[PDB]
Amino acid sequence: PIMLRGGRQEYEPVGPGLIAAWLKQVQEHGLTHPATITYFGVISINFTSVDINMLLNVTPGFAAEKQLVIDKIKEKAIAWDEMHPPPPADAAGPVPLTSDQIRGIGLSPEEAAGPRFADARTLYRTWVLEALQECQRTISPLE
């Protein structure tokens, strides 16, 4: 995540405590349970695309649900690229981004935390939350 420290923007990777806490939330309630989706919304504020993929990728199980969520992200990326062809290399900025760039594909954590990707990481978080929301599980009776 990006955070203000001593007045300046700094980047730090997701900490082991948050990874552990997110994993417990998923295990206890489910990946697409409404409370889990809200939880992801709260924690992922100011995450880079690399941070987001980190949390998605370390989540075990829920293969079916996770696959449906990833499928919806891919659908958004496909739609994005159709509406936004990539510009020539040395075109005047701010240069708009491809879906791969928005999703943090091939980016170092440092790169993904840079100003070039500030709007992009916000947009990717939006795509992921939209995908989760669209796969929301209706709450059912517990054991």
Next chain:
Amino acid sequence: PIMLRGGRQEYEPVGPGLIAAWLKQVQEHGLTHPATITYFGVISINFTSVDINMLLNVTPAEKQLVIDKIKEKAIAWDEMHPPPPAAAGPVPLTSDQIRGIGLSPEEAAGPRFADARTLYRTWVLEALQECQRT
């Protein structure tokens, strides 16, 4: 909302209890707060487009931004989908139809709009998310 009762589909309008509960959520927590977006997601399953508009319309800046985003999606939809040859079904819809404009509550609950209400619910969820700031 559309629900199964005695094994068949039935329609009923949104009730005052749900309206009151939704209003409390928005007042107490905010229109685009993560928990409010989730709350809308829960309550709007099987809503028609008319039901969704009832909830939007009863909700007192941020609301205008959400409506603006829905309009942007409508404009994009219509560019990509010229009105079908005035032809065999299933007939694909205009953004006005998806948004439930000019539909009676009964009409909006019909099979002709079953996919459409689902798509509109998606547009609204997307609009809320895209307007989220805090």
